[PDB]
Design a protein around this ligand. Structure first.
Ligand SMILES: CC[C@H](C)n1cc(C)c2c(C(=O)NCc3c(C)cc(C)[nH]c3=O)cc(-c3ccc(N4CCNCC4)nc3)cc21
Ligand SMILES: [Zn+2]
Ligand SMILES: [Zn+2]
Ligand SMILES: [Zn+2]
Ligand SMILES: [Zn+2]
Ligand SMILES: [Zn+2]
Ligand SMILES: [Zn+2]
Ligand SMILES: [Zn+2]
Ligand SMILES: [Zn+2]
Lengths: 765, 453
């Protein structure tokens, strides 16, 4: 062969492309023409039959309009006269309703902040390259189906799709690679003429190959203990420490939209947490309904032995929990079976420096003293940067590279996810000391509440005297009697807002405003400001794409130094309608809430139902681009009120619309995100997505509530979990990961064993 | 039956924005062969004419039978037709820059109701072919609202909002598929979206259903703002500013014989660099295919100019559009195949007969039989005007060849218009014998075919 002879051949095979196209376009036109639809819903009678020309002949006080007509004839459209003019009376019809105040986008409600990807700036209220690329891509899609039937027709030695893919990333016979080259150019000669914009390099066609393409799809997820680490890889890498979902709102979006999950690998992976559990264990029941090893005592797949391996490592040196009953219920084996396998297997050795206690903070009395405001930046959120929780082996000192003591301008306290303990580390946060049969953890308190002073809400787990454990449980959000005493500083986790209603704002300047639908007393939490969490450049890009570059963009600063803003333009809640006033009746505050940062509004005056809410915007909404160039019922009001969803007008006195928050679209997004990984097998995605669809709906902030929700999941999905080997195995890895974290108590692994065995025996039908 | 329209009547309606006609639609619910009646919408008025064919060339076929003024503050630019669900009398919906749809009882000249809820001006309106009580509004607030005029929905007539992030700027065009469950939307953000509506309950709806994801979404068919979009069967016609083409194209894997996907079947934007995503897709394939581009020279920088296909059983599909320089263009879609057949018979006869081939005009008193008796004989359609010269063959290709998806199909009929005229909208009578083009200067151009003069 010669480059010119094959280019000659391609040129004659190319002849089928336009004639096939003409065949296709012509075929679809005739199918469409013959499938044309018959007009429906005709009336039995002509409804205009009784209506005459309304033209006037040579009225009184009736509006009138003129129309001059011309007639035309011939091929040229020439008129036959200068034309005739007529007058008609006019029927004037006024609308009976006024439009609602203006707005842009469909405003949807979210129960919590969602993490936004970064977008490309394509629309603003080089183009030359973008048109070029699209013309090429359209052409590559046209010719792609022709490559291999043409290679077949030509029958050129070495001219195979696999081998052109080889020559392009440049084993391939001598006259193979010769043909390879002669094919590549010639293709370019026939199809990549650099004069035309409708051109395509063969290389562009090969990159569309289903085996080639995932090479550039950057959606990648990630002794005896090396097997465990690897088996748990997907859970240690994706499992959120805050909320326990594998695709959630936490972690960090990098500029190319790669996510760093807020997961175990952020604090050293499995081992540093697991060694620590083993140690704590070192310094320290009923039989199952499946032929337990308590009472007694078919070849094994390597997956089944792996399953028992990691469950044995993860359970660890436990005193009242053992792998047998749980592994057994995971496989289909009697508890003695795995006991036999376990004993047949015979499955590392386990290894506190006194520190100068800090005078500004006593972690045993739960108290800040003296200089503390000047000593630390734990409480000042606008200057904080987000560092992975410390997982070093030493005391938290600048010497061991502890970011908590050293990464910031001042030391911050170690939090619940730091691998230190309160006994080792004088920086460890221990919750507040408040307790009271009355109200406690207030602003203006004997001793004050250390959680309030640190501008954080109480921790369900560590704040054990104030009753935070119960009052931060959303399931008791409407127990008014509960919340009338005890901890008064978990309003954001309580998740219950004051009754509010959308309306037309009283200000002759604003559109919508938000109005109180109940009485609010000074000091009460009103609402959270939710929205999309975005980066600095994402805010800049959005200010452009919305024509803001007269302020039209509002981007609540959540963490100034870290660079996170909250944009409620599309997703958020009714707080996005609160108007500005220099003397407002509410006030925002940024609060640390279980390692989330969040925005609450608290009333600063007494607001009666029907009154509008205002706050002083202050510097909360910087102009990012310009900084860079340098019985609940509708109240009676004067303003009209609207349903937030339908925008129908509310009747003052009617029942406040309480619409259940619709999140199916958000679960979809998260389901699809895990499905995108080339890194995950179908059986991992299947279970991960199932767990995430349940746990996301629960909006977990605290390990306090994980055991309960975990148990409600094993019970709603027990049938599903036993139907298919891979599902139980993947469930087993989840619980392995959660037990290595000491976040799942032994009491729920046992209750899960019983829930599973009952579903499995129930299936033995 | 191969006949294309001629100008028969024009008129100028007095200036009422002191001014354009922005919409024209013939009433579609009249019993077969009833006099066609259309409404033309200016910024303040709906002009409603009956058209009646005439033996007299100087008779005025047009009768203005109703003239309604929007007595509020709105300037309108969109209309569509519906019916009273109880009485069956015609309802005209008019919408404009305040964000409200007015529904008019036009035979009685009364307000039927107002449709309130958009946060910005409405630029387009469309009735579902499957249900005459279902209306779709496209708005500057970037959403589509689906409204129902059925009795069960009177206390809350918004049954659906197409929201989410599929659109980010003002919408100019909304269109229904004939099955009534697929909606096309497009506008200034250059995104064309296809949404699948759910079935809506036969009862009161406290809140409309919200859809957050289109099932097909692309910004890559055009390189500019898209101001008009329509289904042609399951194919798609769309037009953008600056391009001087109407593009026929196809979503890969889309068929209306397949079951209708639900909301959670929609693709979600997981890769922020992809400018096309689609539920319907089957080497990576195109998710869409450009089929053909009708050439509409001289639209300039004008936008908000709409085309209309005439598409009815047993009659030729006709694409009509008027540009921004006083020209109205027509394409007969059945000519495309007729041309392909005649050119097929031609080459097959030039090979079997060494060039001894004789072309003959059909539609005379002839038959390819009376043609064969006189001596290969090839039947040429009468509307194919000039072995043939090269210029003749190029002139024929330019109008009729569908071999190049980025070629440019020249109008089959180009009728000039007196004075400067920018076309905004085209509408066809039910039986296809009238075609009304409206546009600036409150002018209407009335084209006829199959007349009686
Ligand atoms: C240019 C578009 C830009 C991207 N953008 C983004 C948004 C969210 C938005 C909105 C909007 O959602 N508001 C509701 C609202 C909120 C959310 C909060 C408060 C306190 N209060 C409110 O009302 C409105 C407009 C807009 C356009 C024209 C207009 N007109 C007045 C007189 N000139 C002609 C028409 N007014 C408002 C633009 C918007
Ligand atoms: Zn999370
Ligand atoms: Zn047991
Ligand atoms: Zn440390
Ligand atoms: Zn630390
Ligand atoms: Zn520490
Ligand atoms: Zn306290
Ligand atoms: Zn506390
Ligand atoms: Zn407390």
């Amino acid at each position: 062969w010669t480059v010119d002879k094959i280019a000659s051949a391609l040129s004659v095979l190319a002849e089928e492309v336009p004639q096939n196209h003409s065949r296709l376009v012509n075929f679809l036109l005739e199918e469409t023409e013959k499938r044309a639809p018959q007009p429906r819903h005709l009336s039995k009678t002509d409804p205009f039959a009784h209506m005459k020309s309304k033209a006037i002949d040579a009225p009184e006080g009736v509006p009138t309009m003129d129309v001059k007509f011309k007639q035309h004839s011939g091929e040229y459209g020439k008129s036959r006269n200068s034309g005739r003019r007529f007058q008609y009376p006019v029927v004037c019809i006024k609308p009976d309703r006024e439009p609602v105040p203006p707005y842009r986008f469909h405003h949807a409600e979210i129960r919590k902040n969602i993490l936004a990807l970064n977008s490309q700036l394509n629309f603003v209220p080089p183009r030359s390259q973008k048109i070029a690329k699209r013309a090429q891509a359209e052409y590559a899609a046209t010719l792609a189906p022709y490559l291999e039937p043409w290679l077949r027709k030509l029958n050129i030695e070495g001219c195979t799709k696999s081998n052109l893919i080889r020559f392009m990333a440049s084993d391939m016979s001598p006259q193979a690679v010769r043909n390879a080259s002669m094919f590549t150019e010639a293709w370019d000669r026939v199809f990549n003429d650099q004069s035309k914009l409708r051109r395509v390099a063969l290389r562009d066609i090969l990159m569309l190959d289903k085996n080639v393409e995932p090479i550039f799809d950057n959606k990648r997820a990630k002794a005896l203990m090396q097997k465990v680490i690897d088996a748990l890889g997907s859970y240690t890498t994706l499992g959120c420490l805050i909320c326990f979902s594998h695709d959630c709102e936490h972690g960090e979006i990098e500029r190319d939209n790669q996510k760093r999950c807020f997961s175990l690998e952020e604090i050293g992976g499995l081992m540093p947490s697991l060694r620590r559990k083993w140690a704590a264990q070192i310094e320290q029941h009923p039989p199952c309904r499946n032929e337990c090893y308590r009472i007694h005592g078919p070849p094994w797949s390597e997956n089944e032995v792996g399953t028992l391996e990691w469950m044995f490592a993860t359970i660890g040196y436990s005193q009242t929990l053992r792998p047998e009953c749980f592994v057994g219920a995971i496989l289909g084996r009697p508890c003695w079976d795995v006991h036999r396998k376990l004993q047949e297997l015979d499955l590392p050795p386990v290894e506190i420096p006194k520190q100068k206690s800090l005078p500004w903070y006593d972690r045993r009395k739960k108290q800040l003293m003296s200089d503390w405001a000047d000593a630390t930046i734990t409480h000042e959120h606008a200057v904080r940067e987000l560092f992975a929780p410390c997982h070093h082996d030493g005391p938290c000192t600048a010497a061991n590279g502890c970011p908590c003591a050293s990464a910031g301008t001042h030391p911050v306290l170690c939090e619940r996810f730091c691998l230190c303990t309160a006994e080792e580390c004088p920086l460890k946060f221990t919750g507040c000391a408040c307790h009271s049969s009355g109200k406690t953890c207030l602003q203006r308190q004997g001793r004050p509440c250390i959680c309030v002073q640190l501008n954080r809400e109480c921790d369900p787990t560590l704040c054990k005297g104030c009753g935070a454990r119960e009052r931060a449980d959303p399931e008791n959000a409407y127990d008014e009697v509960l919340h009338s005493t005890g901890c008064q500083n978990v309003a954001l986790q309580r998740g219950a807002a004051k009754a509010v209603v959308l309306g037309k704002s009283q200000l002759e300047a604003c559109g919508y405003g938000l109005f109180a639908a109940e009485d609010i007393e000074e000091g009460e939490f009103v609402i959270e400001y939710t929205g999309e969490l975005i980066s600095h450049d994402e805010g800049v890009r959005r200010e452009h794409r919305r024509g803001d570059v007269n302020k039209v963009s509002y981007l609540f600063t959540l963490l100034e130094q870290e660079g996170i803003w909250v944009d409620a333009a599309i997703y958020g809640n009714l707080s996005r309608y609160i108007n500005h006033a220099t003397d407002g009746n509410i006030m925002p505050k940024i609060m640390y809430v279980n390692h989330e940062w969040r925005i609450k509004f608290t009333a600063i005056k007494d607001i009666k139902a029907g009154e509008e809410l205002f706050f002083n915007y202050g510097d909360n909404f910087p102009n990012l681009t310009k900084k860079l160039v340098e019985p609940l019922l509708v109240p009676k009001t004067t303003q009209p009120l609207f349903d937030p969803l339908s925008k129908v007008q509310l009747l003052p006195g009617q029942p406040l619309p309480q619409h259940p928050i619709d999140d199916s679209w958000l679960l979809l997004k998260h389901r699809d995100n895990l499905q995108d990984f080339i890194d995950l097998r179908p059986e991992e995605k299947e279970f991960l997505q199932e767990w995430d669809a349940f746990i996301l709906r629960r909006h977990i902030s605290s390990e306090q509530y994980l055991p309960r929700y975990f148990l409600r999941f094993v019970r709603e999905k027990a049938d599903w979990l036993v139907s298919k080997r891979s599902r139980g195995e993947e469930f087993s890895k989840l619980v392995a990961t959660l037990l290595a974290r000491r976040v799942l108590p032994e009491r729920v692994v046992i209750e899960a064993t019983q829930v599973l065995n009952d579903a499995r025996g129930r299936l033995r039908e | 039956e191969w006949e294309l329209p001629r100008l028969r009547t024009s008129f100028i309606f007095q200036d009422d924005y002191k001014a354009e006609f922005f919409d024209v639609k013939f009433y579609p619910y009249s019993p077969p062969g009833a006099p066609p009646v259309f409404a033309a919408t200016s910024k303040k008025h709906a002009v409603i004419c009956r058209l009646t064919q005439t033996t007299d060339k100087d008779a005025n076929p047009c009768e203005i039978i109703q003239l309604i003024r929007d007595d509020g503050n709105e300037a309108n630019c969109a209309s569509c037709w519906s019916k009273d669900p109880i009485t069956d009398q015609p309802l005209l919906c008019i919408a404009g820059n305040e964000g409200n749809v007015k529904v008019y009882n036009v035979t009685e000249g009364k307000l039927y109701r107002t449709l309130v809820g958009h946060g910005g001006g409405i630029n387009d309106l469309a009735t579902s072919p499957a249900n005459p009580y279902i209306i779709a509004s496209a708005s500057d607030d970037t959403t589509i609202r689906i409204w129902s005029l059925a009795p069960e929905h009177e206390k809350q007539p918004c049954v659906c909002i197409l929201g989410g992030e599929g659109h980010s700027y003002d919408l100019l065009s909304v269109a229904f598929h004939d099955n009534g469950r697929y909606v096309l939307s497009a506008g200034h953000d250059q995104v064309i979206n296809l949404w699948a509506l759910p079935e809506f309950p036969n009862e009161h709806m406290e809140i409309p259903i919200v859809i957050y994801y289109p099932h097909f979404s692309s910004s890559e068919i055009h390189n500019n703002l898209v101001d008009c979009v329509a289904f042609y069967g399951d194919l798609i016609l769309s037009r953008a500013c600056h391009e001087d083409t109407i593009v026929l194209w196809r979503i890969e894997g889309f068929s209306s014989d397949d079951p209708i996907p639900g909301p959670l079947d929609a693709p979600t934007p997981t890769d922020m660099t992809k400018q096309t995503r689609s539920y319907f897709t089957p080497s990576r394939p195109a998710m869409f295919t450009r089929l053909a581009q009708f050439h509409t020279p001289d639209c300039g920088v004008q936008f908000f100019m709409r085309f209309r296909m005439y598409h009815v059983p047993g009659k030729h599909p006709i694409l009509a559009f008027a540009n921004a320089k006083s020209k109205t263009f027509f394409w007969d879609l059945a000519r495309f195949g007729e041309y392909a057949r005649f050119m097929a018979d031609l080459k097959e006869a030039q090979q079997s007969y060494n060039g001894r081939v004789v072309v003959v005009d059909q539609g005379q008193g002839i038959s390819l039989a009376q043609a064969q008796q006189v001596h290969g004989v090839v039947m040429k359609p009468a509307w194919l005007v000039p072995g043939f010269s090269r210029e003749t063959l190029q002139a024929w290709a330019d109008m009729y060849d569908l071999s190049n998806p980025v070629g440019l199909i020249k109008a089959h009929r180009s009728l000039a218009i007196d004075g400067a005229f920018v076309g905004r909208q085209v509408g066809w009578s039910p039986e296809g014998e009238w075609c009304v083009v409206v546009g600036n200067g409150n002018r209407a151009l009335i084209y006829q075919r199959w007349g009686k003069e």
